[PDB]
């Protein structure tokens, strides 16, 4: 109501003043916000928190001493000299006794002690003696180190000094600690000599403005007589704010102006009446306080040059994320991560708003000063690029799709590499070139070119290039401090270059990087602040809350998009606390709980989450196989699906291209291959979920069986990477082929005799050989064929390994290899033997293990779970079966099974059975609904998985 | 490196205590290295004699024996000025100053310190390039017109001027002239030295015991106050060892002097080896030391603890920050050594505690320092070292009266007079707890405004870190309650007022630079790094599990919450701290079922504070909670019987704070929904049964829901005789609002006050109601809503009450013959209830050609108990009639996969008996439990039909 009238009579003051008041208010704004303002408050702010006047207090001394008030007025000595006429004749104690009963009272601040430090002021120089500006400060939450003598001067322990340069209070009310009277005045430099040294260098370093004083005072007249010795230019002009009943005439605004004084009046800039001093006070005040909350901002060319000056600072960045540009404009606006801005803290003019009227309008556009129209165009390509669209009131359709254009991100390191070892245009140009160098392993190189960028960047303007390039070089310096953490303590790194870095990265505190910029890096760039702190993702991984609470953005697209921006800001800006532990987490986590939340959304089918390209290169860069063996373990990935399969397709040929050219040619780079060994195999296990071409699939197969390294990938993990590939292409000749090739390799491989596969699963070459049959039944191996017709006696290694893969040779090969059967197999055919060599269990085999059996017989009543699966699966049939009754359990429930105690029958052996024998189990008379109730038992009353899996999947 | 410490073993204590300062100086950025001649000279620097020979050379002749004087050292150059000109002049000075001599290796040894600023004396440019080289920006300030101009806040000072503007004699402090009108030449050069000088730790390093400049500035330092200044750390490193009568002059005089020639043996021309010997001595010195003997154990321990006495509890979290992560302090009590290179004083200490033998060497004071350690690190939980011990017992105890809801005692602490600043920080927490957020933020301002005196601070910081969360607070509710609105509109004008600009960002920095090296742990209640360790170790314990990590998980959530409840800070009843205990506590009851947790008092109000009343029937859905015991139950027990003394309070008794009641209903409702699963004796049984039944708002628990949480009641406690009295009367009470005909029963679940009666003959089935039988007898015929009601409950009514209910209320409707179905005396299927289904199906069919029963008239028909086979021809679009009524034709696709949880045990089996029915149960109850992780799917999978 009548705030609005105040605001509305503000603005037209502001619009009714003249060049040179608005131009100070300029340069105040402009010193609040380069935290270089400095208030010089005095007698006059605190009389308008009714603080007792020095009149009444010398009207006591001359009532005290004459015996009656003053017969008038006093002048400025009379002032000074009758406090020391008092002194002098009456004494010490009588005046801090008067001191005490006018000065113990305690008066509360007013509205203009709020207003002083709404401007945030890097120091608050005083001439008050009261802790009124101290209550203020407090109250506020500013911590300002109070100096009131020179004890406080070397003990003041932060960098806001509140500097009472008359004295205080706090120390006692006694005369002894403040400057009140004459030989208190005269002996100020002898006997305040390091706050009056602290006064002159907060003023010469910063900007000063003189609130509380009229152009008549001591306290501005011996300031205004040292700036008088000092040199011309040498010093900033302070400002003057004077706030006297009467407007200031022209002759003593020119005498005080050329003095030093940039006077501000408010009786030439507000009407207010003559004891109204709170109204002018308040008027110039809140004149730069409402300057500083833009609510001045009238002309669209004002509009812009204030958004030109809050982000033309960015333009050396390649990308600004949205928490970023809300940390721009003061958190006035929110930008949100699907580009629309919506308005949060602005009280004034909407600067963001006018940008994107004209944005749509052209002919508005066309209404600007030239300069400011290519200042637009500026940051308009600048909104563009970055996703900042429009307004939310504004926003129609919005396609939210991510583009990292860095060559980091999208593998590529061959082209990575020409970029590398070429001329370098500028010194952005190196520092893209060093990260690169940083992210396919040469830290060395990398370490060096940063320490370039840096040297030749020290004395350079808009200085992102000198910051980012420290940061990355303390960050590429603890990678290689822990790549010797963890792979030593192969040789990574030289031990000259090692105590070269620990003898210049000593003491480099990164906290203090960003304190140590010059102060425009520290204003336009105070976005950049975060990147120094160790920790950074904070403010996005308590973010992913919302995602696992469990009862046009949701929280699963603001995750993503938040994601996306983190990843485009650090793989565009190039910057290496992309490849932390930090940023590993963060992406492990997010993408687990989205994965995990789609899931939980999915299963509430009781009453989706496609990913693209930029999903399937963070879950195979910053996941690991556990971590995606536990997202197989939960959720289903078969209904999250895969897009844009051909970019994943080119991923993972550049990947299984880079693959065999680190194993083919010679790539140790042991450093780079730590991160792209994780990399290849959680790309190619993850390669299960997409559909690959011929050519794709064939050379990542060939990549994955012929050129991954052994110690990383055993031949059983390359079975399940090869399984996974093939489920869901249909395994093309080209490339089944691959694997016989394999399988030939390894059988030439067996030739020397001292060679055995090493497999972690159990899953060896016989089991690539029955993928090859169970896709292509009508296969024989040539190859492997001509092995074993050109194969002796005596090479026994490759006897049993090409034994182990009989199915893929030709009759004649098989023949050849069966030259050497037994027939003193007890039961030695399935022990170590087992590829399918029953077929027909002939009385050749039949009746000799039948006299096997036999000898069991002989063995109990004075192997057999395979006679026993081997019967019920009619594979035994014979009239002899029947005779040797009584042996182990397992025989007596798979040989006669109709009168079987399947109490008896052991809960654990359908764990450790035979598939297509749980199969044939299922359909049957009598085990049919004992091994029923068996596995309800063990599904009650256990606590395994393997029991649940054969219930529900055979039978019923 | 190891001749570096057996220097430091022969220090005397007076250099001993100087490096100490200097290298606290250097880690708190008060450093201030004043380099000088004798720095620049190891480069090769052209010296100022070689020049004033030089002048005397073109002026005087040639030479002058004796090496000159200061006088003649600054007469010559003034006379060669004077005579031949300025030109010569600065035409000698370009021969011998325009030199590319390489940086010395003391230029590096300098800011390797970090130092703030660097007052050189010099004209020469080489610490200038030595700062480049480094990487370290210092705005350098030649001239008088650079001060105001300087780019950053450290200033490479030179003092004596500079080149950079020309070799010029204008540019530099040279002459006699020079050094004359130099205050009247350079006044805010010479302020801005003063100031640095008294605001930093002068360190001078390259000059001599004369040297115009030092007696000059040692001059300025005379005329200080007695101890105003600090005294600068003088530097000497002069060939001659220093006389005892000279330091003692100096020494008076201001300076610090820290000898070379006393400190290192080398040669009369080894000036390097003796300006590194001691910077190399200062800069070893940065890395921690100083710590050897017992007795220094005990004060730099006490040196970074003895600041967090004032916190009633930390975490072992921020215990890793406080030793600058040299310790990884665990939770279970150990702690594991991570970035201690240096001496063990964690192992010491811990060596020190019990073994009296170490203790009574220590001094006296060090004893008084290592009872108050001891005594802290017992009150954390720390135990001892990592390899050492092991038994490690758990059990982390909170004590607040607001964690366990004492919501008496804290207005009882509220209402007394408080005798110390730390009561009313308690007791503003309290008055937060207790909804009253105006008083809260009054008295916080209060503690604000008289934490003056206050060293700590931390009584300050959390209080206004606090404050700006209670406005927070405020500020939410009052746009979330756009009930009624609590605060007047002036308290909202003076939060919006006074806590405007106010950014808790600029909170911690921007304190005192004490502040922020101790109370460093702080500075995360601010944002959201407080939670940022435990959050990651949460998530990664989630993706892992699905000192081991169920425990590490409960002993990181009971330090978090002893943490915030203790040191009594708001930011617990945030959003993200709630979010953090319901996603741990639900992590470790889901682990619980992969196994086991006992659950315990502390779980209890965990899981009833933080949790939902969703998120507890999720975790029910998911795993069982049933089986999951929660261990002492008399301790719960009071908890529920103090939450039901509080709704009473809060509704019986009038007197209700909205503020208070918006985050207490949240928690009264969650605990009496889960006091399930603990057993409560009768008299906690009757409280919280008669403060669910009756003083729970129906705002918030309709009579349905409110049904819900006394089944849940009933079932570890049974339904005694006081509480069927306790739903008499509930009854009785609905009856009596029933009398008139505008009241109706509104649930949200459909459980009307029917079901209660069907609740009390469950567990009695002969409780006759005598009140309500005297109710029945009141029948005037006009009276329906009422006759209606006592018709649901007719089995809790007497043969007399059943006999004049029956003879006026009979089957005439759909509903009440439903009503009939439960309550009983129906079973027959005459054919009128028959055709009265047909005519609410007719009803139904006038919406269908455009609260459902047509499931359970579907129900009815495959229970073979109604028979009439027109109701085929109604069918309808509720495919569970259709499943129910034709098998054949209702396909199974959409069929939700709902509908068997509310199935009962007769009706189950009968879908066991029919093949079609069956068959495909069978898939969609298995897919469900494949894909689903309710366990009540594979129940009804292995109880009829596995």
């Given at each position: ?29 402009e ?86 430090l ?73 006997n ?30 011996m ?17 003057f ?45 809140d ?12 002309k ?8 030109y ?131 396919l ?37 603890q ?45 336009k760039?105070?976005?950049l ?6 920790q ?12 696992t ?26 910057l ?48 690991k ?10 959720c ?5 699906r ?38 290849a ?10 559909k ?10 060939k ?18 990477w ?20 394999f ?45 074993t ?33 037994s ?53 035994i ?17 798979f ?49 395994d ?12």
């Amino acid at each position: 109501l009548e705030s609005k009238r105040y605001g509305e009579k503000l603005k037209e003051v502001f619009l009714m003043l003249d060049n040179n008041v608005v131009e100070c208010i300029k340069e105040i704004t402009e010193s609040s916000r380069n935290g270089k303002l400095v208030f010089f408050v005095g007698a006059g702010v605190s009389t308008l928190s009714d603080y007792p006047q020095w009149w009444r207090l010398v009207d006591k001394y001359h009532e005290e001493l004459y015996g009656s008030p003053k017969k008038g007025n006093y002048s400025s000595d009379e002032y000074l000299r009758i406090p020391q006429i008092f002194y002098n004749v009456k004494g010490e104690m009588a005046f801090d006794g008067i001191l005490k009963d006018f000065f113990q009272v305690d008066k509360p601040t007013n509205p203009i002690h709020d207003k002083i430090l709404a401007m945030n002021p890097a120091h608050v120089i005083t001439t008050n003696y009261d802790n009124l500006i101290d209550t203020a400060c407090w109250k506020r939450g500013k911590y300002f180190s109070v100096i009131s003598a020179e004890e406080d001067v070397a003990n003041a322990t932060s960098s806001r000094y509140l500097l009472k340069v008359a004295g205080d209070f706090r120390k006692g009310f006694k005369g002894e600690n403040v400057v009140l009277k004459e030989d208190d005045y005269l002996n100020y430099d002898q006997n305040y000599p390091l706050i009056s040294n602290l006064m002159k260098t907060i003023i010469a370093t910063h900007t000063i403005v003189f609130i509380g004083y009229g152009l008549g005072d001591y306290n501005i007249n011996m300031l205004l007589n040292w700036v008088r010795k000092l040199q011309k230019d040498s010093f900033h002009k302070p400002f003057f704010i004077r706030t006297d009943p009467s407007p200031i005439e022209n002759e003593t605004l020119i005498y005080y102006e050329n003095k030093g004084l940039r006077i501000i009046d408010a009786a030439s800039l507000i009407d207010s009446n003559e004891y109204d001093y709170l109204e002018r006070y308040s008027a110039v005040m809140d004149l730069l306080i409402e300057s500083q909350e833009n609510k001045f901002i009238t002309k669209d060319d004002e509009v812009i040059d204030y958004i030109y000056g809050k982000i033309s600072p960015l333009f050396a960045l390649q990308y600004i994320r949205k928490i970023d540009l809300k940390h721009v404009f003061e958190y006035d606006y929110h930008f949100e991560v699907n580009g629309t801005v919506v308005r949060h803290k602005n009280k004034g003019f909407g600067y963001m708003e006018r940008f994107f009227e004209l944005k749509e309008s052209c002919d508005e556009r066309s209404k600007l000063s030239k300069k400011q129209y290519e200042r637009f165009n500026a940051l308009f390509n600048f909104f563009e690029k970055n996703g900042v669209i429009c307004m939310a009131k504004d926003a129609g359709t919005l396609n939210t799709s991510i583009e990292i254009n860095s060559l980091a991100y999208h593998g590529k390191y061959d082209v990575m590499k020409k970029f590398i070892e070429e001329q370098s245009v500028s010194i952005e140009d190196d520092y893209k070139k060093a990260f690169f160098l940083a992210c396919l392993g040469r830290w060395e190189e990398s370490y060096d070119l940063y320490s370039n960028i840096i040297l030749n960047s020290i004395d350079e303007s808009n200085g992102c290039v000198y910051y980012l390039s420290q940061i990355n070089r303390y960050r590429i310096y603890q990678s290689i401090t822990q790549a010797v953490t963890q792979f030593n303590g192969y040789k990574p790194f030289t031990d000259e270059f090692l105590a070269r870095i620990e003898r210049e990265m000593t003491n480099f505190n990164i906290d203090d990087l960003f304190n140590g910029m010059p102060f425009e890096f520290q204003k336009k760039y105070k976005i950049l602040e975060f990147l120094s702190d160790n920790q950074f993702l904070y403010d996005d991984t308590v973010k992913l809350f919302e995602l696992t609470n469990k009862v046009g953005m949701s929280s699963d697209i603001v995750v993503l998009l938040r994601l996306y921006d983190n990843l485009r800001f650090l793989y565009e800006n190039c910057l290496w606390s992309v490849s932390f532990h930090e940023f590993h987490q963060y992406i492990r986590n997010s993408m687990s709980l989205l994965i995990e939340k789609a899931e939980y959304e999915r299963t509430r089918d009781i009453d989706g989450f496609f990913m693209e390209y930029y999903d399937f290169v963070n879950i195979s860069r910053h996941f690991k196989i556990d971590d995606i063996k536990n997202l197989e373990r939960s959720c289903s990935i078969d209904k999250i699906r895969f897009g844009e399969q051909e970019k994943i397709e080119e991923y993972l040929v550049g990947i299984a291209e880079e693959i065999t050219k680190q194993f083919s040619a010679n790539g140790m780079n042991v450093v780079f291959y730590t991160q792209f060994i994780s990399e290849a195999k959680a790309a190619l296990y993850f390669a299960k979920y997409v559909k690959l071409s011929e050519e794709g699939l064939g050379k990542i197969v060939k990549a994955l069986l012929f050129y991954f390294p052994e110690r990383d990938l055993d031949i059983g993990k390359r079975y399940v990477w090869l399984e996974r590939l093939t489920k869901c292409n249909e395994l093309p000749k080209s490339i089944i082929s691959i694997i016989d090739d394999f399988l030939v390799l390894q059988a030439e491989k067996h030739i020397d005799q001292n060679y055995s596969e090493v497999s972690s699963n159990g899953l060896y070459s016989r089991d690539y050989g029955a993928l090859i049959k169970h896709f292509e039944k009508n296969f024989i191996s040539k190859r492997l064929s001509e092995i074993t017709l050109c194969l002796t006696q005596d090479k026994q290694k490759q006897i049993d390994f090409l034994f182990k893969l009989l199915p893929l040779l030709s009759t004649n090969a098989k023949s050849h290899l069966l030259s050497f059967k037994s027939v003193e197999n007890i039961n030695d055919l399935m022990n170590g033997i087992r590829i399918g060599l029953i077929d027909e269990f002939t009385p050749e085999h039949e009746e000799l293990i039948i006299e096997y059996l036999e000898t069991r017989k002989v063995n109990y009543i004075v192997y057999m779970s395979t006679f026993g699966i081997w019967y019920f699966l009619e594979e035994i049939n014979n009239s002899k079966m029947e005779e040797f009754i009584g042996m182990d359990d397992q025989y007596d429930f798979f040989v006669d099974p109709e009168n079987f105690d399947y109490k008896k029958f052991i809960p654990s052996w359908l764990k450790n059975y035979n598939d297509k024998l749980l199969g044939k189990i299922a359909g049957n008379k009598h085990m049919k609904h004992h091994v029923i109730e068996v596995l309800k038992e063990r599904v009650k009353n256990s606590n395994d998985k393997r029991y649940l899996e054969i219930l529900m999947n055979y039978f019923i």
